[PDB]
Each structure stands twice: as structure tokens, then as C-alpha cells.
Amino acid sequence: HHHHHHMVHITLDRNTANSWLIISKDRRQVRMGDTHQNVSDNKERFSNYPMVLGAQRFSSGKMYWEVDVTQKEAWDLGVCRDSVQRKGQFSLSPENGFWTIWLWQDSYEAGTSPQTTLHIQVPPCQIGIFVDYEAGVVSFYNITDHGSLIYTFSECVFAGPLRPFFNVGFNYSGGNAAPLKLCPL
Numbered sequence: 001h002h003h004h005h006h007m008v009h010i011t012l013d014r015n016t017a018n019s020w021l022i023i024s025k026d027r028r029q030v031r032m033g034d035t036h037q038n039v040s041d042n043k044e045r046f047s048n049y050p051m052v053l054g055a056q057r058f059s060s061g062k063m064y065w066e067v068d069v070t071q072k073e074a075w076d077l078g079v080c081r082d083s084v085q086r087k088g089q090f091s092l093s094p095e096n097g098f099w100t101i102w103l104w105q106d107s108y109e110a111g112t113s114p115q116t117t118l119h120i121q122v123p124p125c126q127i128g129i130f131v132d133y134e135a136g137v138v139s140f141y142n143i144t145d146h147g148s149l150i151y152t153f154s155e156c157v158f159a160g161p162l163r164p165f166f167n168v169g170f171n172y173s174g175g176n177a178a179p180l181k182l183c184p185l
């Protein structure tokens with residue numbers, strides 16, 4: 001792909017994070033803590049899952065960023081509406097305002113309803129995410145496999161400002177402690 005020139009500098013928004021997440025001082029890395037991280041509750045925080053939003057809001061244009069997922073067993077990545085539900089149980093679907101892919105139990109799937117199987121021959125260590133707001137497109141790229149396409153959501157109905165979306169996943173196994181990292185431009 002030739003989307004690299006739309007690169008944007010994404011930072012994480014502390015105030016949206018699940019209370020067990022640890023966001024680095026530079027706001028470029030997030031990981032699961034082993035306990036509550038001693039922050040107050042607020043209506044922005046994701047309560048049920050280890051999720052956080054980027055600070056940036058997008059309502060036009062073309063945007064591209066990359067995320068490092070090295071040695072993780074589970075994660076979700078993509079974009080979501082600024083107004084997604086924060087509290088309680090919900091599925092990641094375009095109907096609920098999410099355009100995402102994930103890794104879970106050794107398989108990759110796109111967050112459609114119902115979910116779609118992805119065909120990845122080279123497990124990615126870094127994922128590229130491209131958003132074209134006007135075209136209604138969200139695309140995912142395998143940076144480890146020379147930028148190969150993973151998945152395209154098309155005919156997206158964003159219906160609001162978009163935020164970068166992250167889930168570091170649960171660490172019940174002891175094998176998913178590694179962080180998500182925003183990779184340099």
C-alpha cells in the first residue's frame with residue numbers, strides 16, 4: 001500500500017482507560033496492570049474490558065497509524081465512534097460504532113456481526129490502520145508481511161467523529177502481559 005504519507009501521531013487518552021491499564025509517560029504505550037491503578041472513576045472509562053481510546057478525533061480526511069502487537073495472545077484494534085457505550089457488556093460491531101479486527105485463541109477475525117474469519121499466513125508483529133472518512137473505508141495491513149491487506153470495511157456509516165480504539169486484552173493465561181505500542185512515523 002501507499003498510505004504511509006497520511007501518517008498521524010496518535011496518543012492515548014488516560015481518562016478513557018479501564019482503571020487497570022498503565023499508559024506510558026509519552027502516551028504511546030499501554031499494558032494491563034496486575035491491579036487497579038489508583039485512579040478515580042468517570043463516565044468515559046471502559047468498565048468491563050481493558051480498552052482505551054486515542055486522544056485524536058477525526059471527522060474528515062485520510063489517516064494512517066501503526067501498532068506493535070509483538071508476543072500478545074489477544075487484542076482488538078481499529079476505530080470507533082466518539083459516542084460508543086463505555087459501561088457494561090457489548091459486542092464490537094459497526095452497529096455499535098466499532099470498526100475493528102482482533103486476535104483471540106490463535107485466530108484473527110474482523111469485528112463484523114457476525115464476525116468474519118481473516119486469512120493471515122504471517123502472524124503480524126505490527127498492524128497498519130488506514131481510515132478514509134469521506135469514502136467510508138477502514139483498512140488493516142500486515143506490516144510484517146510487506147504491508148499485505150488483512151481486511152477492508154467499506155460502505156462504513158461512521159455517523160460521528162472517530163477515535164483510535166485499543167484493547168490490550170485479558171491476561172488470564174500469563175502469556176498476554178505485553179503492551180500495545182504506537183510505532184514511530
Ligand SMILES: CCOC(=O)CN1CCS(=O)(=O)CC1
Binds near residue numbers: 018047049
Ligand atoms: C479489565 C476488567 O478486569 C477484569 O476482568 C479483572 N482481571 C481479569 C483477569 S486479567 O486480565 O489477568 C486482570 C484483570
